Backbone:
């Protein structure tokens, strides 16, 4: 309680609780009357570690970057217990019977969540009569009990075409996504089981939603699935499947495995209810392997930014395109640009590096680059360029993380290694991660790629080729240090890389 | 040609060419008459890098650890071209018409391989009349041409039940494994396409074989598949599927994705033909991201050890078992044990570390541990133990790689980071890799696990829980340095880990 790392460590525009522990985001919805985005979260107010009693924390936002934290929304009946993950729906037509005439239809808020008690996980419901700040648990909870220890994380949505509420929920250790239906929110029927992809140890946090295909009238149903432990990257990861849904079973178009975000730190993704126009969601931005040991205090964990989800046909090799999940960050105009560097058609060479030259630093930056690979035979050790994110100098040292692209491998990479920062379970804190991408485009016969990145004091979110792939990782600079400036460098004497466009901004609340 | 790193860098019992570049192993077969294992391989004699003309190199062995290199077996028609990957079968009954009355049935050797020419990849055959040392290409090559640029890596086998030769080959960029049948080895018919798992950039090096289930009469068909680039670990990786095969189509038992080896350096896996009793195979032990840049000379690349493949029902979580691919290394008794450390029931503590104390070092070691996790509440930074593989001291420093287990994560890990060793494309040389495993067993209520590891100068092969998962990685110690001794250490004051059995051996040719 006496050490506060916020000054250098606490994100400006990623949500964090003032104190205590946060994991999975819950009950994501938009209130159309109040015009407020609601974020709830797995919350332990009593320590910077997971533990019971576990609650739903609650915060609101009008723009998905500025958050007001509120009083705890739901709590367990005993210290022995926890209100585990869930989702919220708006029961406009009072199908649940909970709501007065005088409750605004857009605020008829129902939470559906896992109630965790010793040897039992059930699905329970509660309703809010005050706009989502307090709740009354349903008299006849549980609404679903299958006598299981491992039965959690409901995502519920109204399905017009089959005229019912749909729940996807994990039967975690059976590796099944279970699909239930209800008229009621109270009485549920099991319609199907879905099993596929990368099983790890466990299925968690399913989601199922209609995602729009870019430049078209058409859509596909996407099933989201979280697994932890046992990610091939180590620990926790989120995956997806593309297909069709009739209200009863989900049928994927193929049987391939794909991850939502191939950084180490993007887990328990959930989408917002009541979004008109598109699909928005966010995740918990850490990894279960080390999330409770990173050096922040008096809180641990942030969410990712909210992101916009679409589908796009992209080349995965030279011959073949696949319909692929695209995501791009939600950043409203209510963000102040303190300063920016903006350049066009720069021929990058080791004698001409790009260097930010701002007066100060908030620790929040973004960078936005479109680049072209030239025809130049260069030595193997130099077929790359690198973006450096440097702290201020402190113990007469600068800390930095590196983001680059190698043209011989057609792959982006990050290196988040920081010397002299140690914490428990760092054996699992992978430093070097890569992503292979086909060109965004061809200009004549030269390969074009794009990269957008945003750095917020302890988290970096990278989006390659207009969101073709996303990679999210936290990073921990030494005590007192935070991002101060940005450089783009290369070791080539002539130009291998031409940056058609470079924009680097310092940003603030 | 003047620098030779062999002294510290060249494996003793993993095959390497004397000079030049090697990638994928080819034409693996056992000659029953000669009693010789044959290894062919993608070979460039003219540089320590991939390039055309590309040949099949050739080596033989009576025990799968001692290799005799021979003259190039197959070469391209022009410098423009390459004999890409392939397999060998023994046509005992002369179905191909190539073989005399006086050619021993067990030596009726036919190679089936991809002929790579500009804008064209076809499948071609050649036969050997002198036991596999020289070949005559078939008069009417190609045997299969589908007018494709991306059509390569045939694995062929006799399928008794449908009375035909089967070929699995990759239609690389279409992400299809294509299954062809022949009476002939000359005239082929397409029977099915198979598409699943982790797509990556490209399908390569398929395999299809009947694998025995442990302690039973039963078996399953396993389909192997290599992808590169685009492994979720970065670069190249091998995956598999378990199911059934009728000679015409492969039908997996589920749609899950699983990798054969979750280290960075295990690619283009092939099995040996003419193995009676079980399934044996090996891979190329590097990763395409950096294989051509690692600091060895005058050669680059080794194969993995030959491994024995079985299927076993293992716990993937506390509730659920899955039928899972098991592998264990083939190490004959023709291996000399120079010295060994052997201990039983050791309560590991930071005051009582295990330390090898041998007179010298060949650079080749193995370690074999069964251990039990005790009930001891210890601080989070200490819930692990570590195996250290140390070089001799040189520039007044010891280089080392680390292999460990953390009990809070139930996961093994490696850290192959070595200071002051640099080479091109090391951004992709991932240092930290993990593997989550359920307990091998329970002793009362205490968790039991096992680990076998083998280190051979520049390559480490780890096998967790009697081969439940395998992890293969190269490593590059500083100039002159190689493994000299081994330690097992922990930071706990009391004992969290009891090692029921520990055997560390120094080994030699
Ligand atoms: C946990 O937090 C709750 C609410 O802030 C508080 O009532 C309680 O005392 C804390 N600790 C325990 C063990 O309940
Ligand atoms: C789905 O899974 C559960 C196992 O938990 C089983 O009880 C149920 O019968 C299955 N339903 C269908 C439709 O397969
Ligand atoms: C979501 O992205 C989509 C593009 O399909 C757009 O319709 C919508 O306005 C976006 N919402 C936000 C908050 O950016
Ligand atoms: C990065 O580059 C340009 C700058 O206007 C733009 O097309 C693109 O939207 C930028 N990306 C983001 C996410 O702001
Ligand atoms: C079989 O062919 C070989 C190889 O050229 C030849 O030497 C041999 O004499 C032939 N044997 C018979 C029986 O024709
Ligand atoms: C096998 O896939 C090939 C290559 O695309 C295709 O032409 C052929 O029609 C496929 N056959 C079947 C039965 O799917
Ligand atoms: C391969 O391992 C299997 C496992 O039972 C065994 O039957 C066979 O004899 C082994 N062969 C070798 C060379 O280890
Ligand atoms: C290591 O020890 C096990 C169990 O004691 C033994 O059965 C096995 O043969 C050894 N394994 C290897 C790969 O040498």
Residues:
């Amino acid at each position: 309680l006496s050490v506060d790392t916020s000054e250098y460590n606490r994100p400006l525009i990623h949500f964090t609780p003032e104190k205590g522990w946060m994991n999975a985001p819950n009950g994501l919805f938009y209130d159309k009357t109040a015009k407020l985005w609601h974020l709830y979260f797995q919350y332990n107010p009593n320590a910077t570690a997971w533990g019971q009693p576990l609650y739903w924390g609650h915060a609101t936002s009008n723009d998905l970057v500025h958050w007001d934290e509120h009083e705890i929304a739901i709590g367990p009946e005993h210290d022995n217990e926890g209100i585990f993950s869930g989702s919220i729906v708006v029961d406009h037509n009072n199908t649940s019977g909970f709501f007065n005439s005088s409750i605004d239809p857009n605020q008829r808020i129902v939470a559906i969540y896992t109630n965790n008690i010793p040897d039992n996980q059930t699905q329970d419901i509660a309703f809010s009569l005050d706009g989502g700040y307090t709740f009354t648990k349903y008299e006849n909870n549980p609404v679903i009990d299958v006598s299981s220890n491992q039965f959690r994380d409901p995502k519920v949505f109204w399905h017009e075409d089959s005229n019912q509420w749909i729940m996807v929920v994990s039967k975690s250790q059976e590796y099944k996504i279970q699909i239930f239906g209800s008229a009621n929110l109270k009485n549920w029927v099991l319609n199907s089981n879905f099993s596929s992809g990368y099983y790890g140890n466990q299925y968690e946090c399913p989601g199922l939603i209609e995602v729009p295909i870019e430049n078209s009238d058409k859509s596909k149903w996407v099933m989201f699935l979280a697994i932890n432990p046992g990610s091939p990257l180590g620990g926790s990861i989120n995956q997806y499947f593309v297909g069709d849904f009739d209200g009863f079973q989900f049928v994927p178009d193929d049987s391939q495995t794909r991850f939502v975000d191939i950084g180490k730190d993007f887990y328990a993704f959930q989408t917002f209810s009541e979004v008109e126009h598109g699909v928005l969601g966010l995740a918990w931005a850490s990894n279960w392997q080390y999330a409770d040991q990173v050096p922040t205090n008096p809180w641990r964990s942030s969410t990712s930014l909210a992101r916009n989800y679409t589908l796009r046909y992209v080349h995965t090799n030279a011959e073949t395109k696949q319909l692929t999940l695209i995501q791009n960050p939600v950043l409203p105009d209510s963000i102040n640009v303190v300063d920016k560097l903006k350049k066009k058609n720069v021929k990058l060479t080791n004698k001409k590096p790009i260097k930010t030259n701002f007066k100060g630093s908030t620790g929040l930056f973004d960078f936005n680059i479109t680049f072209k690979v030239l025809n130049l035979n260069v030595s193997p050790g130099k077929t790359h360029f690198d973006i450096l994110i440097n702290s201020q100098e402190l113990n007469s040292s600068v800390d930095s993380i590196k983001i680059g692209f190698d043209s011989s491998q057609s792959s982006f990479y990050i290196d988040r290694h920081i010397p002299n920062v140690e914490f428990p379970r760092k054996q699992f804190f992978t430093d070097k991660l890569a992503a292979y991408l086909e060109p965004l485009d061809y200009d004549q016969d030269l390969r074009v790629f794009s990269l957008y990145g945003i750095v917020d004091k302890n988290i970096i979110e990278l989006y390659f080729n207009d969101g073709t792939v996303a990679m999210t990782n936290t990073f921990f600079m030494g005590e007192g240090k935070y991002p101060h400036d940005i450089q783009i460098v290369t070791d080539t004497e002539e130009p291998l890389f031409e940056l058609e466009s470079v924009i680097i901004r310092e940003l603030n609340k």
The helical segments of chain B are 6-9. Residues B 100-102, 129 surround 2-acetamido-2-deoxy-beta-D-glucopyranose (ligand 5) (CB under 6 Å). The two ends of chain B are 25 Å apart (CA to CA). The first strand of chain B starts at residue 20 and ends at 31.
